[PDB]
Amino acid sequence: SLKHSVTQYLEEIPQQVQNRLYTSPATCLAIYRILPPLAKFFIMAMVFNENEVPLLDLDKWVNSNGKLQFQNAIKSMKSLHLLIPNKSSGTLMINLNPTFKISLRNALTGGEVQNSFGVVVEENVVSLDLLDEYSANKWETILHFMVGTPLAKIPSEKVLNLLKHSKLMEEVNSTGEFKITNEGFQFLLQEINSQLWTLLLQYLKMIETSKMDLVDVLHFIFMLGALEVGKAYKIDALSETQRIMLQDMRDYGLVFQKHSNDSIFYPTKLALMLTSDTIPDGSLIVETNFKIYSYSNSPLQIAVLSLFVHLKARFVNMVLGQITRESIRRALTNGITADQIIAYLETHAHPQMRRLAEEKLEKKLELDPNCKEPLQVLPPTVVDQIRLWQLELDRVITYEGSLYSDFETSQEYNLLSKYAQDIGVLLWKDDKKKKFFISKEGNSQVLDFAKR
């Protein structure tokens, strides 16, 4: 989800780069906040004592009901290279990472932190009036660009290349429009904190050039998570690489700047929401006649609902729409699966639909208590119709490759078919018809097998 993604990314970091990442206390604190509570407890009990701690002593800490979780915590400390094992006196002694321990101690007690948390310049503006509005403006700009609605203002080419080179948001130049993938509608589903995290890890994946240093980006991301909204910070502590990527998130919306290349920068609410989280708008009512009464006023929810709902009228409160066959066909031609649509309709379901489903299930349990049913918050007829439209899109599946036949001997056909099955590219075979089919990627292997 959120912690798993940053945990897997920090696994891919090399050990020397990982130890170089432990210099700034803010990075160490932000990394430590990701760890499991048992791992955090062991680390925090292990920082303040300079002597090494045996692993058998740590095993005695955990009760028998959570021992497996202990192993998982150890596995995380066996993944992030925080605990160094040692073989001494026939014992698996455990030592703490010295740079991480020193930086965490400096973060806790205070002291030499080399301005990892920045310096406050005491000049500030209203966060809700300007800083929340700027971050929401940039986020709505990039989201309205990626959902495909027309915009008077489009974001700059730095994020257009980000969307082009990403797995989501495919682009075509033959038509001049941008096509949303399945991963795009997946990105529209979850809450904005892990959306920002997925964006930042994709940006981290792209950065390989000599203009940008990876450790500086990780330090800057973690201190932006450490910065507080409503108070600007000076740019002088940042490097020129950090300055240009500060401008990059000024365009992106994680940070606000009054003017370009200013001496100060204002953190936004997305900076604090990057670490952890904390009827509604977009709540919808589905009926049997496929009418969607979606209580939405923000253009983002209306735009993402327009991907699969034929909108009819717009009010201040809801958007009167209808789930038609053509709108669902439009959604499925973008690769948006029916399960994603059903999950979106479930997550945005009205409280009144929830009450009606609860009453129906209460009548069901007092009638048939022998079996239990899931709480179908939305009617099953529209779910079945969505899945039916998904099925009629995929009535045929087309595999392209090569079919081999015309074998005078059955033994040669059997040998080639079992070779194709062993290399895992065969899709169908028959000795009665003497034909076997292989995929496009598996053609050349059988070609070099037959030629040699």
Site for other proteins in 232-291 (CB under 8 A): 275-276, 278, 285, 287-289, 291
- CA dist 345 and 321 (Å) reads 13
Q: 123, 191, 228, 281: which one contacts other proteins (CB under 8 A)?
A: 228
Note whether 77 binds other proteins by CB under 8 A.
Answer: no
Considering only 94-102, 179-187, 241-249, 393-401, which stretch makes contact with other proteins by CB under 8 A?
Answer: 393-401
Closest CB to other proteins among 177 and 208? 177
**3-state secondary structure labels for all residues of 185-239:** HHHCCCCHHHHHHHHHHHHHHHCCCCCCCHHHHHHHHHHHHHCCCCCCEECCCCC
CB of 165 to other proteins, least distance (A): 26
Q: 14, 150, 280, 380: which one contacts other proteins (CB under 8 A)?
A: 150
Residues in region 331-370 near other proteins by CB under 8 A: 350, 352-353, 355-356, 366
- Please report where in the chains the tokens 């432990």 appear, as a residue: 22
Residues in region 299-328 near other proteins by CB under 8 A: 299, 302-303, 306, 311-318, 320, 325
Residues in region 401-420 near other proteins by CB under 8 A: 401-407, 412, 416
| Other beta carbons less than 10 A from residue 282's beta carbon | 20
Beta bridge partners of 87: 92
CB of 93 to other proteins, least distance (A): 24
Single-letter residue type at 305? L
Judge whether 149 and 305 are in contact, CB under 8 Å: no
Residues in region 87-126 near other proteins by CB under 8 A: 104, 107-111, 113, 115, 117, 119-120
Q: Tokens standing for 321?
A: 């729409």
b vs e for 226-240, b when ≥16 Cβ sit within 10 Å of the residue's Cβ? bbebbbbbebeebee
CB of 276 to other proteins, least distance (A): 5
CB of 448 to other proteins, least distance (A): 13
Note whether 128 binds other proteins by CB under 8 A.
Answer: no
Q: Tokens standing for 257?
A: 């700047």
Sign for the pseudo-dihedral over CA of 413, 415, 419, 424:
positive
Judge whether 207 and 220 are in contact, CB under 8 Å: no
Q: 13, 226, 336, 426: which one contacts other proteins (CB under 8 A)?
A: 226
